Design a protein around this ligand. Sequence first.
Ligand SMILES: Nc1ccn([C@@H]2O[C@H](COP(=O)(O)OP(=O)(O)O)[C@@H](O)[C@H]2O)c(=O)n1
Ligand SMILES: [Cl-]
Ligand SMILES: [Mn+2]
Ligand SMILES: [Mn+2]
Ligand SMILES: [Mn+2]
Length: 534
Amino acid sequence: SSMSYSWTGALITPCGPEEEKLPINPLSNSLLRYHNKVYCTTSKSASQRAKKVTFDRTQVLDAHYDSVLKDIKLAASKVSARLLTLQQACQLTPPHSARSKYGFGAKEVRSLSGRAVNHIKSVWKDLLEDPQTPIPTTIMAKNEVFCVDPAKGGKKPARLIVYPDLGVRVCEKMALYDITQKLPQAVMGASYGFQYSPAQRVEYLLKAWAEKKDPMGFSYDTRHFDSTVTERDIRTEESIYQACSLPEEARTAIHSLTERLYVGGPMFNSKGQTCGYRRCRASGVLTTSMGNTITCYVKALAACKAAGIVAPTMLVCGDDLIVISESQGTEEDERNLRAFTEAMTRYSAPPGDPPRPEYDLELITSCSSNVSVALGPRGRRRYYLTRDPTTPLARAAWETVRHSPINSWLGNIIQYAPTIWVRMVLMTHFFSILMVQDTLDQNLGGVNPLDLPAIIERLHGLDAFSMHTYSHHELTRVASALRKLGAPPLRVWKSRARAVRASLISRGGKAAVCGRYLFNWAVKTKLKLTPLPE
RNA sequence: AGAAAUUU
RNA sequence: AAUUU
Ligand SMILES: Nc1ccn([C@@H]2O[C@H](COP(=O)(O)OP(=O)(O)O)[C@@H](O)[C@H]2O)c(=O)n1
Ligand SMILES: [Cl-]
Ligand SMILES: [Mn+2]
Ligand SMILES: [Mn+2]
Ligand SMILES: [Mn+2]
């Protein structure tokens, strides 16, 4: 029936200028050599993304769907939820949120400027009065950085972002924010993945795995998920929101937002022209993340039920899920995953890469990450979270006039501190750079480099400083990513580490603690590391 | 230059 | 600020 998009043919314009690297990258030309491989998805590529997401959806549901949907509404009934004062909603607006077409931006919104508040009052009135005139949206290409992959296309075309004006964004929050805080958790219980920390994720997966007599695992992801969301899906999303205790005033706002915005509408490029019309998810609305997650969850649990998946333990984050089940033998397991996929396709969530049964936790990737294992100080197995380092390294080398990648190095150092690639490569590079600059005592994205050992202890355990004997998978993949980006191989990073280390120790203070803890892997004379007050 | 979550 | 979807 429904096409996901129609296009006028008007271009998808830039929302400002898109910078390119320079002939010298002084911060990353000692990190890696192959800068030609590091690119940023551009709005020029958006046309290509559009061709790939424009297609015809033919959803076909069934008792398993209907049944899972029922039970989900019985959960929604436990939720009571409130409107949010116009002012509270204003102040959940992020600092840089794109300005309104109507002469005010996020400074005003956030500080409750009167011009902004009246406009928002009027917009909210109009949602209550008019429950049908479609609401215009702006469409734009997301600028992300990646490493080229000649196997998988060369250069990814840019993601499409579609969003209403700022006034509308605030009103969304008024109507729905509280729901976004109660509904998913209530509907999905422990399957709601965003509720967990990475440590909890890892523990959860191991618990699910240990619980089975004979575990089987797999993951799933929908191709161009936002395109695959049907008008009917979005209304079923509404109907699930409504199944809560709500003020009547919310119900009207919800229903109006659904009908005028969420279910579809016209699209304008940044230069103002009509660009096309939309009959699927607009990734840009408040309900993007909750919608996606709940909707993926319905289809997936129905699909599980269709396929025969036994004793499923699920974990869902948007369109990404992991199911750990009781295996029924591999011959049956393959058959059931094929069925799972057929069912998901019928429901309109067709697979990017068709899934496969797995019987080892390391081989299950989801949200671009997987669990892995190394040995700890005493020799116990220590399970942790990791990923292909290709992208983070690529982003580590993204230097332009406007952008510095140092903050990425730090963010990755913290999130993935226990990984061999963070420990040997990123840390080494990061510290090495700040020492030469003489900016160790500086603050980056409100974090003090010299705090890192503490920060890493609070978040990952003291084990993150002594881990050893990384897996074959992990070693292979790291080696292979460095070669792919023209980086030194790990042995060189060993050298650079020793040098940085001694150079850090000789400075004393917290710097020396950094040198001693973050780099104890780099020495044969390995010191006994004690917990840290801070 | 969209939203949310986690981390800080 | 970082990452993810
Ligand atoms: N930057 C992003 C990335 C994903 N998403 C949402 O999450 C969905 C699934 O993410 P994905 O990483 O599998 O990308 P798709 O190719 O499935 O669109 C997208 O279609 C978007 O609706 C988003 O809203 N903003
Ligand atoms: Cl141990
Ligand atoms: Mn997807
Ligand atoms: Mn309604
Ligand atoms: Mn995904």
